[PDB]
Amino acid sequence: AAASYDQLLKQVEALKMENSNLRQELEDNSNHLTKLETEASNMKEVLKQLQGSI
């Protein structure tokens, strides 16, 4: 049979926390992608000015 009103309330509480955690993760990982690209690019950039050379 269907969950009681209280059982649903518990599902919602756990679902909301999970949703908050998933957002935190995506946010973390999204920032991590950005920092990885920045690092790759700084490398590309310092590589150019070095190949320049003398």
UniProtKB/Swiss-Prot annotation:
Subcellular location: Cell junction, Adherens junction; Cytoplasm, Cytoskeleton; Cell projection, Lamellipodium; Cell projection, Ruffle membrane
Residues forming coiled coils: 1-54
Signal sequence, renumbered to the chain: none
Other noteworthy facts: APC mutations have led to some interesting observations. (1) the great majority of the mutations found to date would result in truncation of the APC product. (2) almost all the mutations have occurred within the first half of the coding sequence, and somatic mutations in colorectal tumors are further clustered in a particular region, called MCR (mutation cluster region). (3) most identified point mutations in the APC gene are transitions from cytosine to other nucleotides. (4) the location of germline mutations tends to correlate with the number of colorectal polyps in FAP1 patients.
Family: Belongs to the adenomatous polyposis coli (APC) family.
Annotated disorder: Familial adenomatous polyposis 1: An autosomal dominant cancer predisposition syndrome characterized by adenomatous polyps of the colon and rectum, but also of upper gastrointestinal tract (ampullary, duodenal and gastric adenomas). This is a viciously premalignant disease with one or more polyps progressing through dysplasia to malignancy in untreated gene carriers with a median age at diagnosis of 40 years. Desmoid disease, hereditary: An autosomal dominant disease characterized by multifocal fibromatosis of the abdominal wall and mesentery. Desmoid tumors can also affect paraspinal muscles, breast, occiput, arms, and lower ribs.
Domain notes from UniProt: The microtubule tip localization signal (MtLS) motif; mediates interaction with MAPRE1 and targeting to the growing microtubule plus ends. The basic region (residues 2167-2674) mediates the association with both microtubule and actin proteins and promotes the bundling of F-actin.
Summary of subunit composition and partner proteins: Forms homooligomers. Found in a complex consisting of ARHGEF4, APC and CTNNB1. Found in a complex composed of MACF1, APC, AXIN1, CTNNB1 and GSK3B. The complex composed, at least, of APC, CTNNB1 and GSK3B interacts with JPT1; the interaction requires the inactive form of GSK3B (phosphorylated at 'Ser-9'). Interacts with APC2. Interacts with DLG1 (via PDZ domains) and DLG3 (via PDZ domains). Interacts with alpha- and beta-catenins. Interacts with AXIN1 (via RGS domain). Interacts with ARHGEF4 (via N-terminus).
Protein name, entry field: Adenomatous polyposis coli protein
